[PDB]
């Protein structure tokens, strides 16, 4: 048989999960345990720290007796996942001495068994260290508007200054062709909760981020429809996209 | 403490206006007077002249105390105007002796206000006055058909010959791989007036234009569905796109014999 068997509900979920951190990470090692799958990685510039977690709620059949490490490339993994239709179901199967992971796309009415092998590139560089749990300011807003503002202010400069004063969220950019300031305020929409802006403030904050890393972050907007942001001075900012059984979070480092 | 305050009712109008000719003009002066906005600019090769008039009937609010000149690049303007969504109002502001210009994007039912600044570019304006001439041929045709004809003929050669003879339009192109010809006859359609070709002529004419200039001009076919064409044997062709409160004119000079 197999030690590891993990089945998904659909095929378009792992697609967007891999598309999330496909532009800032080259290789990644997934840790498969009894409580689900976890992963984390850092970019080559050591600025953005991606952390993925998915429990046993998004899966339908999950069986892993002992935790296993699967270190694989993300580009070839996406090339493999590109061949999957939106009506198939992925079944990750893994055996002893992990050297090749087998993906299997299967349909439930027509016999379409698409099997694909993928070698495992072992890096043995895990370095999982998370210490901060208390942030200075927290907010939640639709990911679409965040991505819009980001890719609108990214053309003007490479450094975007996010500053949270009293109930006024402010994104600033200043360059050679001009300047740009986006000021938004929280509000609760009863007709649509998904278009609301929630904010909790303890102290006024003001700090800058890089446009490239922020553009790499906003690429994970296909996972959910609402993004959470946690800012704290002398602390890496947290950009979280929730998921029915987990989350994808980016830890970003400010600039000078 | 601002000279001019202009308020576009839709944010997409100015975006389309700038996108109509952002491919043939790099630097441009905008002359803001009490009647509206007037802006003319020559091409880099001095072959295509672009003129734009937006009357006061297109601004929701428009003060413009005294006439001013705002020189700005079209690339940065198109980069700034691209940010705004569809459901926003745009406001242009210029301070006394302006070193920059302020563009405000506001929402109708939300407090989200997006303000941008654009640094003006100094331009030595060689303002040339254009006088009305009696064009030998004057017609108007659907902009979609004209753009299709231009894109179809420009693939064979780098020169398109337009001949108006005996209530007959002829677009011909003689290239290396072969030749191409398109014949147009005037007619009216009662059920769809937007698909009727108008024709008014005095003498038969024959002119030759470049392919790149026509391909650049036809890109402004998103402002109006019917484009007007004025041709003369000794005058540059005039291609006009009418806007609900003004117009956009392209003066293109023909080639030699």
């Amino acid at each position: 048989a197999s030690m590891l068997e993990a089945k998904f509900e659909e095929a378009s979920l792992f697609k967007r999960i891999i598309d999330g951190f496909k532009d800032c990470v080259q290789l990644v090692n997934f840790q498969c345990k009894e409580d689900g799958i976890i992963a984390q990685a850092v970019d080559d510039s050591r600025v953005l720290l991606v952390s993925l977690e998915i429990g046993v709620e998004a899966f339908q059949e999950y069986r892993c007796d002992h935790p296993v490490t699967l270190g694989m490339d993300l580009t070839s993994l996406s090339k493999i996942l590109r061949c999957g239709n939106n009506t198939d179901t992925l079944t990750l199967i893994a055996d002893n001495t992990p050297d090749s992971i087998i993906l299997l796309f299967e349909d439930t009415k027509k016999d379409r068994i698409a099997e694909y092998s993928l070698k495992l590139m072992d890096i043995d560089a895990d370095f999982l260290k998370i210490e901060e749990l208390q942030y200075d300011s927290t907010l939640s807003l639709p990911s679409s508007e965040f991505s819009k503002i980001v890719r609108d202010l990214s053309q003007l400069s490479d450094s975007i200054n996010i500053m949270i004063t009293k109930e006024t969220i402010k994104f600033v950019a200043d360059g050679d062709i001009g300047s740009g300031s986006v000021i938004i305020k929280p509000f609760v929409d009863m007709e649509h909760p998904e278009t609301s802006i929630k904010l909790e403030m303890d102290q006024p904050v003001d700090l800058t981020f890089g446009a490239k890393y922020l553009l790499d972050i906003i690429k994970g907007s296909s996972l959910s429809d609402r993004v959470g942001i946690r800012l704290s001075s002398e602390a890496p900012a947290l950009f979280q996209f929730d998921l029915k059984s987990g989350f994808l979070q980016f830890f970003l480092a400010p600039k000078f | 403490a601002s000279m001019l305050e202009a308020k576009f009712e839709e944010a997409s109008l100015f975006k389309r206006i700038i996108d109509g000719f952002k491919d043939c003009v790099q630097l441009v002066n905008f002359q803001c007077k009490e009647d509206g906005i007037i802006a003319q600019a020559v091409d880099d090769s001095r072959v295509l002249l672009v003129s734009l008039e937006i009357g006061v009937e297109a601004f929701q609010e428009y003060r413009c105390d005294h006439p001013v000149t705002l020189g700005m690049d079209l690339t940065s303007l198109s980069k700034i105007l691209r940010c705004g969504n569809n459901t926003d109002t745009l406001t242009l502001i210029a301070d006394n002796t302006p070193d920059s210009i302020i563009l405000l994007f506001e929402d109708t039912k939300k407090d989200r206000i997006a303000e941008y600044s654009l640094k003006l570019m100094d331009i030595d304006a060689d303002f040339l006055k254009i006088e009305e001439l009696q064009y030998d041929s004057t017609l108007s045709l659907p902009s979609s058909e004209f753009s299709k004809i231009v894109r179809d003929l420009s693939q064979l050669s780098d020169s398109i010959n337009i001949m108006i003879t005996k209530e007959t339009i002829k677009f011909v192109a003689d290239g290396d791989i072969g030749s191409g010809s398109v014949i147009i006859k005037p007619f009216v359609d009662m059920e769809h007036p937007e698909t009727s070709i108008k024709l008014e002529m005095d003498q038969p004419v024959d002119l030759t234009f470049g392919a790149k200039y026509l391909l650049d001009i036809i890109k402004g076919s998103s402002l109006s569905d019917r484009v007007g064409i004025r041709l003369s044997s000794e005058a540059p062709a005039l291609f006009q796109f009418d806007l609900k409160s003004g117009f956009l004119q392209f003066f293109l000079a023909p080639k030699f014999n």
């Binding site: 050679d176 | 630097l27 020189g71 690049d73 002796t97 302006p98 070193d99 640094k119 003006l120 570019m121 100094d122 331009i123």
Partner: protein, 315 residues
């Protein structure tokens, strides 16, 4: 900590001590306003960048943040940069007083490629009504001929002993440090006209030994002592000179380049001997320096240099 070469940097054009006529001309330019394109050339560390910085500051007042574009060796200066950014900055609109103008300060212009310097001629010629260029280079020979023809050349001479001494006096007066005349003379000797190096050596001596004395200066500079070098270059017999060079200077691990440079700088100030013998000893020391620099720093070369110096001082 804070480097004294950065804390006591002149912020006004009057605080710069050195070439008086060029500074007077720059003061007159800043007072009038009509500033032309200028290439500032000169030896390193005599106040070239600081001069143009104070000039731009005094010219633009509160507009230094908007009407000054500085490009050093850290920024990228290629064909694309010169064609796009400098051009878009020159055409940038700015309301200034009738005399003032925008300023583009290019530091270390001798490092810019010829192709990049080529695309600046028309840029600086067509927009001469609202943009003035200020290049700062060490060698005016690496700048192409059209550029050198378009702008005025301002040469900066090496700093004299009096000006560096006055600057050090002002620094020690404002810093409240203990010193002696011998230490100041040693600093002037080891500085050879480098104000920045002089201030750095003074700060190092103060932070290391407190009292500025010749012994501490020559201990912190890690160079051969001028006294023992003069003793080596003035012995009556060649054997004593060779012994002094062997036991006192070669055994201590001194670099041959440093020994030759110290002998050169000592022979220049040896006011005891005559002029012709000084010039000839300097010629011999320079020949030995050229021999050392060509890949052979053998002790035999220094021995032959001492032998020739002795034979010339006895003949």
């Amino acid at each position: 900590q804070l480097p004294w070469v950065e804390k006591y940097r002149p912020q006004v054009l009057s605080d710069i001590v050195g070439n008086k006529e060029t500074i007077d001309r720059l003061q007159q330019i800043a007072k009038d306003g009509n500033m032309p394109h200028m290439i500032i050339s000169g030896m390193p560390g005599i106040g070239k960048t600081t001069s143009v910085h104070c000039l731009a500051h005094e010219l633009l007042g509160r507009s230094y943040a908007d009407g000054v574009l500085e490009l050093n060796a850290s920024d990228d200066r290629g064909i694309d940069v010169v064609r796009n950014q400098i051009k878009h900055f020159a055409q940038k609109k700015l309301h200034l007083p009738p005399g003032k103008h925008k300023i583009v300060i290019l530091d270390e212009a001798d490092s810019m490629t010829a192709g990049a310097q080529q695309a600046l001629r028309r840029t600086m010629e067509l927009y001469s009504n609202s943009t003035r260029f200020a290049f700062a280079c060490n060698q005016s020979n690496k700048i192409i001929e059209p550029l050198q023809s378009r702008c005025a050349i301002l040469r900066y001479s090496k700093l004299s002993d009096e000006d560096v001494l006055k600057r050090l006096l002002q620094i020690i007066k404002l810093e409240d440090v203990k010193y002696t005349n011998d230490g100041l003379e040693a600093i002037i000797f080891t500085a050879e006209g480098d104000m920045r190096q002089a201030i750095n050596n003074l700060q190092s001596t103060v932070a290391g030994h407190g009292l500025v004395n010749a012994d501490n200066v020559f201990k912190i500079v890690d160079s051969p002592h001028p006294l023992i070098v003069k003793k080596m270059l003035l012995a009556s017999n060649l054997e004593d000179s060779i012994q002094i060079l062997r036991t006192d200077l070669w055994k201590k691990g001194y670099s041959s380049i440093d020994i030759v440079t110290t002998s050169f700088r000592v022979t220049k100030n040896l006011a005891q001997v005559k002029e012709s013998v000084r010039l000839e000893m300097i010629k011999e020391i320079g020949l030995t320096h050229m021999r050392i620099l060509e890949g052979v720093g053998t002790y035999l070369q220094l021995a032959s240099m001492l032998a020739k110096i002795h034979k010339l001082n006895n003949k």
